[PDB]
Amino acid sequence: SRAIMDYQDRVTHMDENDYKKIINRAKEYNKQFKTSGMKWHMTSQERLDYNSQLAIDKTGNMGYISIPKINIKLPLYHGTSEKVLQTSIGHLEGSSLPIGGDSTHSILSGHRGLPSSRLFSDLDKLKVGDHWTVSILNETYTYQVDQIRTVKPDDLRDLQIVKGKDYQTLVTCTPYGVNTHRLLVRGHRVPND
Numbered sequence: 001s002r003a004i005m006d007y008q009d010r011v012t013h014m015d016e017n018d019y020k021k022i023i024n025r026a027k028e029y030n031k032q033f034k035t036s037g038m039k040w041h042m043t044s045q046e047r048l049d050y051n052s053q054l055a056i057d058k059t060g061n062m063g064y065i066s067i068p069k070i071n072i073k074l075p076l077y078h079g080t081s082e083k084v085l086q087t088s089i090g091h092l093e094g095s096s097l098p099i100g101g102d103s104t105h106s107i108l109s110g111h112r113g114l115p116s117s118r119l120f121s122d123l124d125k126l127k128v129g130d131h132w133t134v135s136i137l138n139e140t141y142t143y144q145v146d147q148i149r150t151v152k153p154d155d156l157r158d159l160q161i162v163k164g165k166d167y168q169t170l171v172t173c174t175p176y177g178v179n180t181h182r183l184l185v186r187g188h189r190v191p192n193d
Contacts, residue, residue: 003075003088004064010056011137019137023099026053030096033161034103039094051078053097054136062098063136065089065108070122076134080109087117096161098134098168100141100189105167107159108134112173112183120172126185133192134168143168143187150174150181158184 029049033039039046054062060078067073076098080090089110091097096104110120130145149158159169166189173179 001073003059003061004073007056007061007063007075014056014137022054022056022137023139026097026099027101029053030099030101030104033096033105034163037161038105038156038159042094047093050093054099056137060084062091063134065098065132065134067126067132069130070125072118072120072122074110074119076108085109085111085119086114089119092171095159098141099136099139100166100168102166103161103163105159105161105165105169107169107171109171112176112179120170121176123170123172123183123185124174124176126170131190131193132170132187140192141168142190142192144190145185145187147184147186149184149186151184153180153182155182158186 042050062076062078064073064075075088077084077088077090079093084090089108092107092109095107098106098108100106113119113121126145126148128145128148132143134141151158168187170185172183174181174183
């Protein structure tokens with residue numbers, strides 16, 4: 001959790017105009033999805049823009065996710081490279097940034113456990129009604145489970161932009177140790193506690 005400590009410490013010394021610039025750019029970014037839908041076919045240009053969003057250093061670390069029910073607190077990174085997923089949670093690069101907004105759908109991915117790290121091992125313990133939060137800069141974003149689906153790897157029907165909705169889906173492999181399917185835990189934006 002040193003990544004999280006380092007991230008927190010960095011945010012502590014940012015000007016309040018620093019938050020505003022970064023948050024505003026991320027909001028502007030997330031505005032595109034209402035017309036564009038998911039950006040499965042992301043161009044080099046778009047990928048460069050993406051990497052600059054919610055970035056306060058060169059690590060790719062966007063913030064961190066908290067799932068009290070299963071005792072997870074992990075750093076969130078740009079993209080879903082094997083490097084990222086070996087120790088942290090990845091953000092699917094063509095999905096909306098995890099600050100939500102109207103007509104957005106952010107997708108976060110994590111291995112269903114590795115030899116010495118739980119990651120999203122216990123994602124199956126989550127139930128409709130449960131909450132998680134993502135912390136980005138000085139702000140909190142809360143999501144509440146409203147749909148749980150198990151699907152084939154190529155089924156992207158539950159992973160689309162829905163107009164007038166603010167969604168975040170947590171994705172991992174399933175069954176545990178078999179990994180033939182994908183477990184999708186969708187939540188919608190709710191007010192912070």
